[PDB]
Amino acid sequence: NLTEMLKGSLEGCVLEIISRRETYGYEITRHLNDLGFTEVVEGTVYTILVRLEKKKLVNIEKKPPRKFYSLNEAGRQELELFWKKWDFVSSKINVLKSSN
Amino acid sequence: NLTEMLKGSLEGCVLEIISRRETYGYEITRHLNDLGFTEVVEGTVYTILVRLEKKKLVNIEKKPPRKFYSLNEAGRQELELFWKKWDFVSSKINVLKSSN
């Protein structure tokens, strides 16, 4: 049960996945499952994709009815900020772990 | 602004701090600030300490009116689980980062 711990990082993982190429909810979910986040279900990814759309971080396209997501410039900018935040937070938590 | 990302890990960082020796809210807060989580304020630590008390993870002592916190056996058990969760979640997020 990693939900609470993973919650605050999950939007970024999704942005990272969408960055690699045009994709869609089902495939994002399976990619997160394949990574080892087996408890991540489609509805969790759906909700994230909605948040990313309202923040205007992704370009959308109805293709052959499915929405295809890729990153726009804001999205790439935002993904960069996420990883800088991740690197900082994780390094400091590991500095703390390092003493037990 | 690391609050959302740090939120799901902050209770564990506190448990880790209390584990090292008997301590109290102000000192825990300053320890987190000194680590680099400068936006962590006392009220955030207070709220966490309350959660840890209701989960019965800490022994409390009114000493010379301040409450002194140390870990009981449940608390040590729980801290161990937190770090196992942290190691898993962070390793998988870093596996993902490793491809950009």
Numbering used by the authors:
A (entry chain A), B (entry chain A): 3 to 66, 72 to 107
Copy out sentences from the published article reporting this entry, exactly as the authors wrote them.
In this study, we have determined the crystal structures of bcPadR1 and bcPadR2, which are the products of gene loci BC4206 and BCE3449 of B. cereus strains ATCC 14579 and ATCC 10987, respectively. The bcPadR1 and bcPadR2 subunits contain a typical wHTH DNA-binding domain, consisting of helices α1, α2, the DNA recognition helix α3 and strands β1 and β2 (together forming the wing), and a dimerization domain, including the C-terminal helix α4. Unlike LmrR, but like the other PadR-s2 proteins with known structure, the bcPadR1 and bcPadR2 dimers have a completely closed dimer interface. The closed dimer conformation and inaccessibility of the conserved tryptophan residues of the bcPadR proteins are incompatible with a drug-binding mechanism as observed in LmrR.
